[PDB]
Amino acid sequence: DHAIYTAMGAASQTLNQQAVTASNLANASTPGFRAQLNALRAVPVDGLSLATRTLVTASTPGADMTPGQLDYTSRPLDVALQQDGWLVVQAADGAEGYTRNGNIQVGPTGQLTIQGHPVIGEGGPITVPEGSEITIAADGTISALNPGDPPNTVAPVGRLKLVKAEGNEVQRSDDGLFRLTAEAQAERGAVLAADPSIRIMSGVLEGSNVKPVEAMTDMIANARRFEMQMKVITSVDENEGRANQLLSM
Amino acid sequence: MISSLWIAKTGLDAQQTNMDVIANNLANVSTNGFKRQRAVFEDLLYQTIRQPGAQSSEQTTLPSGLQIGTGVRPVATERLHSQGNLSQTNNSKDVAIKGQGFFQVMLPDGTSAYTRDGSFQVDQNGQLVTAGGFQVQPAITIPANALSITIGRDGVVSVTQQGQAAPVQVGQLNLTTFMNDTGLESIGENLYIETQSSGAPNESTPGLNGAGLLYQGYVETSNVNVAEELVNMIQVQRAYEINSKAVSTTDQMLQKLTQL
Amino acid sequence: MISSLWIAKTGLDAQQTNMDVIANNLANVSTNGFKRQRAVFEDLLYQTIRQPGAQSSEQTTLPSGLQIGTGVRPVATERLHSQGNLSQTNNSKDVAIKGQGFFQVMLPDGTSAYTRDGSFQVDQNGQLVTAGGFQVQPAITIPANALSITIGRDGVVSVTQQGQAAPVQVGQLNLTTFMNDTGLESIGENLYIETQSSGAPNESTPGLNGAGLLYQGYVETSNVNVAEELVNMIQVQRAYEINSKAVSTTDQMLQKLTQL
């Protein structure tokens, strides 16, 4: 009779997987989006005799740090990181989140702001002169040429800090921004170094790594598993109902 | 209603918004001075359900926690201000811009808008207007019997009279530059109005203080890259089909749930 | 999810990766020195389920055991290093390679990359660069007011000056060869970095110790055979459709199974 619960669990948790895939799948064409891969965990129910039941709890082990594929836009300050690279960004609460969105923007007052909550590099938020005409180099240096000055005045105005971290040592933080896992904090510290070997691809953006192929069979298997759970539930309740005649008379 | 249905719904709406952007972008080829518009999306706040445990590292273990998340809300429609090509109209009153800058224009309701469009004319009174009667600022009034008009490379507009061997300097057609060009509020009719995201407008003569120069007889073209739009259309169509499949899968699962 | 679904999705992954290889290899026609890539796949291990019995040879008996196996993981992406055709660029500071060899370039971070590309220039200080300013090691510093630059077949680069009847030898442009050209780890920007599969770089003047000569005024073109890419594209599309049919057949099997 308690079998139904286990089956229920599976059904319920499968819906959660569906949910993940859906959010994983609507976010195609979202810049620099990291697909949230998902798994199902068996959960044994260690008890006093005959360990027979296991639950099907749903989980998201992390994000897929597979570089999405690049779109060439020729915009001077659209940035693409190399593999395992991250742009550091001052989060809403204030802490160094990490993103792959290189769609940098400038405000009227010269705040470099990957979609606002600005970008962090070599100091606080990067600031540039208001008539920016920004150019971003390969290693991260940012040079600015005021529009009405001779072009041999492109002296660098800042540097864009980049950080190397991937997969096991990075987790999403309830915003599009990633942080370290607090297991990679009794390690390379709270604030990472600049790692002067991560390169920048200028004029090119990165799209989401939402693999449609594995998502489509994610959904196919999810549907099939769900209706298998429904069959188990149906048989269990019919068993119990037809059983209930024992106690009468 | 469960989260899967509405998440796939917001995916479908985002693809629809992207297609609206592309269709507008493609209709406005052959609109002088038009700037292509790019839709930028974003994910929504992830509803965490179970925080991850500790990586005991005794055995290689999956870092399983659980956060589901939702949504692909459109966060921006940027305007790419790159210089478009020029077309020769042989029209003396036409004008194109070399580099950053906009023409300031007085709207009927009294506010000042700004346009990167040069298809000028003259009203019956002689004032410079923009294909729609919007006065160009500061007002430039042409005498009645000008043989020819000339707008120089810094906007010094002058006319030639019958008899004078000298083009009386009749006005100055100065430009206006913004700190953040992309932030302008496009109100249609090829006009933008300045907002808090663009800063106050800085007015100056063309060629000075970062403003561009003026090309008489030429008009700027829309900088729409149709290859980008076609490939984006293919992307949008297939993403739409994928999200439609997601909705269908969730609906079928819900049917199977509600049979029993 | 049953094994058939995951095996067919490995197949679809493989065809998608092959299409990415083809698309990259295709888009880089008119890229100087580019070397075509070929995707090489490998099957994954076979799980024996029921070992074959004894072939008693009393009769012709089918040798039936049962091993299923799985997957098509991509095992390599071989860079087909061959001498591409030459195209004349008429640029004095340009050069292609006759045979194997790589120009050594000092990366911004300090290490050395290697490029098969002669789109060279001179920066403001006379140093040779590679279309992006990366210095060509060892540095070759062209004098300020040279009349002409000559790079000989063995890299001896000289300049002609106003008045002297002698091409003063201003530098040497030596090549680098590897014992396994295919193993170089490509990093983008037409650059390869040496890895354990290529061995140490061996430096030498062109034409000696197996290094190829130098041809000035010419650029090596990509050795991409577009007919091969088109035929591979047809094959990839058909294989993708077949694998999708495998997924669909398994899925309708599963639908019927879960009906009852």
Place this chain on the structure above:
Amino acid sequence: PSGLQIGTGVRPVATERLHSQGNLSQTNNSKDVAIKGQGFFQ
């Protein structure tokens, strides 16, 4: 080999001008001049 690569894109890096000597065309104009060898008029 400890990995493979897929790669993407063919981004343009530069447009280099060819600063060679052009031919000379006679304009029969006293004012007009042309340049042998390199150099620019300020």
